[PDB]
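INPUT
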Amino acid sequence: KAKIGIVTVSDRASAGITADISGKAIILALNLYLTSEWEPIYQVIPDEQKVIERTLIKMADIQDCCLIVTTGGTGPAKRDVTPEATEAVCDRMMPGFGELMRAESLKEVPTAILSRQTAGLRGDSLIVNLPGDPASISDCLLAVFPAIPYCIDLMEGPYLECNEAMIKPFRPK
Amino acid sequence: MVRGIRGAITVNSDTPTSIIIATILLLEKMLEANGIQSYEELAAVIFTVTEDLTSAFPAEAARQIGMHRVPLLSAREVPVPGSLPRVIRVLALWNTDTPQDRVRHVYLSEAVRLRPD
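OUTPUT
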């Protein structure tokens, strides 16, 4: 059974002021993507870099999450420190993810170059940064996930199986 | 004695995943905003989508959250030039005695520009 981490980085959300929404969309999307058995590990944490670092490390090292997805704090604002926390906990970075998500949003919004989202690997766990805007989460997650099940394959992790009607992942033979 | 609940939400692209997610989010916010416990209070739910959204029926979002026994019907919105693109609109028929001015209507994402309240 696979475990997938969902981390929402927002001060107002973790305080209880506003509802998540963004984290809810990520879980709804994964439920549409996947047909195999999986379990969501979900956390809401404030915009504190050390808190983000520990949350990612717990999910990857203790709770055995093959994929961890974050939403929030990836822009040029002062409190946006999620990309730095991801680089801290990752021994290897996946630059192709960050390039692709910006190239897709650039087709629509010119400010996509302000996005500092990135992705990397902590051991055999894949961590991916998603935008904080709930509207942009579906498009962004849909652009990178076709490559994710084969990535977890190369790291000898669980075999994620997808509903081909909702998303079609790529796997060479 | 029936009261209609109106809902609207937008999507960034015409993909099946994005249509279903947005409709799930919209549907659940219209239910919460009116304190609707069970689906058995709904007589029917009607959906409209704009011309630029064709990749999925919004009815699949209702079955995704357990509305298998709720009657659903979808249709195409009037293609008014210059109107808001990629809008999913909902008209739910609610079996209740709630006064008209106390029914809460939900407009989400870019669809908040549709009503100035």
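end of record. The helical segments of chain B are 16-32, 59-64.
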